[PDB]
Structure formats: structure tokens, C-alpha cells
Amino acid sequence: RADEVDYTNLPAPKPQKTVWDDNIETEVLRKYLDGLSQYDMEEAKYGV
């Protein structure tokens, strides 16, 4: 009868960086879309 499981362990939510379609509207907006992706990843890591 050895250790079974660490019930106080949660697999961290593996985030995924949103990928935008490559058009002119993305090249013009590249900085803004990158900021949105960074904000999304930060929210996913922290929780909200």
C-alpha cells in the first residue's frame, strides 16, 4: 500500500496563442493583434 495520488495537484491549463489569418488587415493590425494574443495568454495563465 504505497502512495496513490496527490489530490492537491492540478495539471496547469496549457495555453495556446491565438493565431490570426495572414491578410492585409492583419499586417496593418499586427501590433494590436499581438497585444490581444498576449492578453489572452496572460488571462489563461492567471485565470481571468
Binding site: 496593418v28 493590425l29 501590433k31 494590436y32 497585444g35 490581444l36
Partner: protein
């Protein structure tokens, strides 16, 4: 009638040469003071970001 006229005649070539150089000097200085001036305008991405924030997104 004779003396001063001859010495004025002798002066003409050098004065003409020096004044041509002076005129070229003025033109050269006029060109040298010209320099394309590029202006910088607020990037529209910050406008697009403030637009998004105002939406409460």
C-alpha cells in the same frame, strides 16, 4: 581722361571674377540649407487599441 580710365579697365576682370564667385557662393549656401523634413504622426494602432478598450472588451 587717361590714367584713371586705364586703371578702372585693369580692375574689371578681377572684380568680375570675384563677383561671379560670390554669386555662386550664395547659390551654394541656398542649396546647402535645404533638407527634406519627415514628419511623424500618431500610429493608428494606438487609436485601434483605445477604440477596443472603450468597447469594454
Amino acid at each position: 581722361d587717361i590714367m584713371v580710365p586705364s586703371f578702372v579697365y585693369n580692375k574689371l576682370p578681377v572684380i568680375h571674377f570675384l563677383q561671379e564667385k560670390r554669386a555662386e557662393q550664395k547659390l551654394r549656401r541656398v542649396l546647402d540649407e535645404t533638407y527634406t523634413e519627415w514628419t511623424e504622426e500618431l500610429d493608428q494602432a494606438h487609436v485601434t487599441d483605445a477604440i477596443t478598450r472603450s468597447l469594454n472588451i
